[PDB]
Design an enzyme around this catalytic site. Structure first.
Site, short mmCIF file in Angstrom:
data_model
loop_
_atom_site.label_atom_id
_atom_site.label_comp_id
_atom_site.label_asym_id
_atom_site.label_seq_id
_atom_site.Cartn_x
_atom_site.Cartn_y
_atom_site.Cartn_z
N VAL A 115 0.83 -1.20 0.00
CA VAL A 115 0.00 0.00 0.00
C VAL A 115 0.87 1.25 0.00
O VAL A 115 1.81 1.37 0.79
CB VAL A 115 -0.93 0.02 1.23
CG1 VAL A 115 -1.83 1.24 1.18
CG2 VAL A 115 -1.77 -1.25 1.26
N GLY A 152 2.74 1.95 -2.33
CA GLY A 152 3.99 1.48 -2.91
C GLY A 152 4.58 2.35 -4.00
O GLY A 152 5.64 2.02 -4.54
N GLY A 153 3.90 3.44 -4.33
CA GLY A 153 4.39 4.34 -5.36
C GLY A 153 4.66 3.67 -6.69
O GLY A 153 3.80 2.96 -7.23
N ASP A 171 -1.50 2.06 -5.11
CA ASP A 171 -1.31 3.47 -4.83
C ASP A 171 -2.38 4.26 -5.56
O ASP A 171 -3.33 3.69 -6.09
CB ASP A 171 0.09 3.91 -5.28
CG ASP A 171 0.62 5.07 -4.46
OD1 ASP A 171 -0.05 6.12 -4.43
OD2 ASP A 171 1.70 4.92 -3.85
N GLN A 172 -2.24 5.59 -5.57
CA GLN A 172 -3.19 6.46 -6.25
C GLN A 172 -3.12 6.30 -7.76
O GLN A 172 -2.05 6.10 -8.33
CB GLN A 172 -2.92 7.92 -5.91
CG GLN A 172 -3.36 8.33 -4.54
CD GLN A 172 -3.03 9.78 -4.26
OE1 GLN A 172 -1.86 10.13 -4.05
NE2 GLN A 172 -4.04 10.63 -4.26
N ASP A 228 -8.01 4.07 -3.99
CA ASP A 228 -8.01 4.88 -2.79
C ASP A 228 -8.03 3.97 -1.57
O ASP A 228 -9.04 3.33 -1.28
CB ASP A 228 -9.22 5.81 -2.78
CG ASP A 228 -9.38 6.54 -1.46
OD1 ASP A 228 -8.37 6.76 -0.77
OD2 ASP A 228 -10.53 6.91 -1.12
N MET A 229 -6.90 3.92 -0.86
CA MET A 229 -6.77 3.07 0.30
C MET A 229 -7.80 3.34 1.38
O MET A 229 -8.00 2.50 2.26
CB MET A 229 -5.37 3.19 0.88
CG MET A 229 -5.09 4.52 1.52
SD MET A 229 -3.37 4.66 1.96
CE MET A 229 -3.29 3.51 3.23
N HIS A 269 2.19 6.39 9.53
CA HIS A 269 2.97 7.46 10.11
C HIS A 269 2.45 8.85 9.75
O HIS A 269 2.40 9.75 10.60
CB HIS A 269 4.42 7.34 9.65
CG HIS A 269 5.27 8.50 10.04
ND1 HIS A 269 5.70 8.71 11.33
CD2 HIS A 269 5.75 9.54 9.31
CE1 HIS A 269 6.41 9.82 11.38
NE2 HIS A 269 6.45 10.35 10.17
#
Ligand SMILES: Nc1ncnc2c1ncn2[C@@H]1O[C@H](CSCC[C@H](N)C(=O)O)[C@@H](O)[C@H]1O
Ligand SMILES: Nc1ncnc2c1ncn2[C@@H]1O[C@H](CSCC[C@H](N)C(=O)O)[C@@H](O)[C@H]1O
Ligand SMILES: O=C1c2ccc(O)cc2O[C@H](O)[C@H]1c1ccc(O)cc1
Ligand SMILES: O=C1c2ccc(O)cc2O[C@H](O)[C@H]1c1ccc(O)cc1
Lengths: 358, 358
Positions: free
Chosen positions: A200, A202-203, A224-225, A244-245, A262
């Site tokens: 998630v 992960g770019g 990712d997005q 969208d996570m 984070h």
């Protein structure tokens, strides 16, 4: 009474904290001096003179090298030994050898942390502390860095006159993410019995690439997005998916949340954790969620570790107004999400890998 | 092999040293925030809100106060407790109390060290570290401060634009010398059985004055250079004498060498020690020499103390190119002088009072 007496060990406690910064400066000096590299390259204990010779020091700086070495040796970054000596002059001399801690200073090694020590202790990281008093007493909500310079840390690094500072910063970050490979190699057990995994946030896939270097058979999905994944196509075991996570996460045996929670408050973090539990429900009690972030355990027997974690937490606050969660905050989050248990594994000196189970 | 494995506790050791400076900055913040004074004045455990109220903080800084407090509490500068709370709102809150270490931060008390912590951690004390690399690699023999600013520390303090810095420095020095009174009160045993004492390098008598505040019956002789004592007359138990300590020292039951040997090399220090032994020979095996300086004991079981002493030794080097002696260096000096034995008593957190016997 006699309580007024005893200038206690209170004075020694107070002073040890006043001068703690010196240990950080001495270490910084060791890396900029390239001592580790010199000893490593010599392939055998080095003498003060030999070492002074390798660093091409002016004869007047030799005694300075000696003083820094004595302190560093006491702090465990070097080990003293005894050697004979060539020719008829001299007699008996002390030699210096690296230790596990200083070996982390050997450049060109997958374990080198030199760049992080350089940046964490660069003037751009430390000078702002002179504005601390003004920072506490002002009405403006801003980082300590912003209070001291008038600009955010990021804008500072992106000034033309700070070109080298920015590259120094990105060297440290790249070096840090690189250390994740060591985390994988050191905790194979965590990913061993998995068939699939979704990274998630992960770019473009940099993290899944490291994951594949260790587990080439693991089916990974980089989530990712839409704008980030976009085109990107994969292979048999590499998959790119956009979404969208906060709405949903692709199903898999395990969900990886590396440095994701984070950057989110409890409300947003809980939703991600809940979508994570749903993405592994199909696997039943076999599924798991892997969180990679910092966890500060105050009740920990290792007082020194907690202190370091809190120290790092104070840097995040002063430099970015960021924050790190404590073990409790994690537990509240994990159970509010619906999970049954969890296990924390210390990694990279003071970070944490959290295994969460349904 | 598996040695390559284990990113060891080497990483945690490395990081703990990188971020040690934070503990020093947090402490500095505690003194500039006046937290100790606020709690002391409240005369009872203070709550986060009460404390935020006393410091008149902007509501946005409260959470910053909390973060610093959590770290300081972990480091033992405050103790957490539990209080009820007035009114029907709220529930249960944590209060903060001072500890021996933080009580040293209460201003207006003979024990206040606030000024020393302020100066030791002032930008003028820390900013020079950014020049450390250049300092090791240059051909010029100078302090790190001189390398970073182009002027000695002393010349810096005496610039018109540094008026306040100089006063800050002299406040710390005056506060430090003042702490000597605590040393006397805490070690009466040392001067108790003496009839006479000669304060070498006693200047105009400031130290002998403190000595008299505790031992009004002790016959003290302030010995220094002819130009320093000059006119100065004394009383029944106060005596001023001019001369050259390298040629001779006035006889007395005891010789006090307070921060004297510190400024002299072995050759000059040995001569002073020898003249000191001769000044007490008349008293026989009853005479003694009292040295007040720093002694670094590397073989000491208290690793933390030695580290602090070494830390302080590194500050002396970077700021002045000065140095502190180790226990061994002291022993060699003491015996080369002709003395039989000696005893070291730790004082003022990391200093030492040495009793030398013929
Ligand atoms: N709603 C959303 N769904 C999925 N990813 C999102 C998102 N909002 C932001 N992101 C992603 O959040 C990521 C944070 S970067 C997190 C670090 C990363 N896992 C690593 O190992 O380096 C970004 O790549 C960003 O595109
Ligand atoms: N040959 C000499 N004999 C006696 N005193 C000397 C001297 N050369 C220098 N001094 C004295 O060395 C002193 C150093 S100051 C030492 C500190 C002092 N005992 C204290 O408690 O603060 C000065 O006062 C200086 O006048
Ligand atoms: O590694 C770090 C770091 C590295 C280089 C630098 O120049 C500044 C820094 O600030 C901190 O000391 C630390 C950091 C960690 C995470 C992060 O996102 C930002 C900074
Ligand atoms: O107490 C000290 C100190 C106090 C104030 C200041 O602004 C700088 C300082 O430098 C050191 O941190 C330390 C010191 C001790 C003895 C000495 O002769 C000079 C400095």
């Amino acid at each position: 009474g006699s309580e007024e007496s005893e200038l206690y060990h209170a004075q020694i406690h107070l002073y040890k904290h006043v001068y703690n910064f010196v240990s950080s400066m001495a270490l910084k000096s060791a890396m900029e001096l390239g001592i580790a590299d010199a000893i490593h390259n010599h392939g055998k204990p080095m003498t003060l003179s030999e070492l002074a010779s390798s660093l091409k020091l002016h004869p007047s700086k030799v005694n300075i090298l000696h003083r820094f070495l004595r302190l560093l040796t006491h702090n465990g970054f070097f080990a003293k030994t005894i050697v004979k000596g060539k020719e008829g002059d001299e007699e008996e001399e002390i030699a210096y050898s690296l230790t596990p801690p200083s070996k982390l200073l050997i450049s060109g090694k997958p374990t080198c942390l030199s760049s992080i020590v350089k940046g964490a202790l660069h003037p751009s990281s430390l000078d702002m502390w002179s504005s601390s008093k003004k920072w506490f007493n002002e009405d403006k909500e801003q980082t300590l860095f912003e209070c001291a310079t008038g600009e955010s840390f990021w804008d500072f690094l992106n000034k033309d006159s700070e070109s080298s500072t920015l590259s120094m910063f990105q060297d440290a970050m790249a070096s840090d993410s690189r250390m994740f490979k060591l985390v994988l190699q050191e905790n194979k057990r965590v990913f061993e019995g998995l068939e699939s995994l979704v990274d998630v946030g992960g770019g473009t896939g940099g993290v899944t690439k490291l994951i594949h270097e260790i587990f080439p058979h693991l089916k990974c999905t980089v989530f990712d997005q839409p704008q980030v994944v976009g085109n990107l196509t994969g292979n048999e075991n590499l998959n790119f998916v956009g979404g969208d996570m906060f709405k949903s996460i692709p199903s898999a045996d395990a969900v990886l949340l590396k440095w994701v929670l984070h950057d989110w408050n409890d409300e947003q973090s809980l939703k991600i954790l809940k979508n994570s539990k749903e993405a592994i429900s199909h696997k039943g009690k076999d599924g798991k969620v892997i969180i990679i972030d910092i966890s500060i355990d105050e009740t920990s027997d290792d007082r020194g570790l907690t202190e370091l974690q809190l120290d790092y937490d104070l840097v995040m606050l002063t430099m970015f107004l960021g924050k790190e969660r404590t073990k409790q905050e994690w537990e509240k989050l994990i159970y509010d999400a619906g999970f049954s248990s969890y296990k924390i594994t210390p990694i990279s000196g003071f970070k944490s890998l959290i295994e969460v189970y349904p």
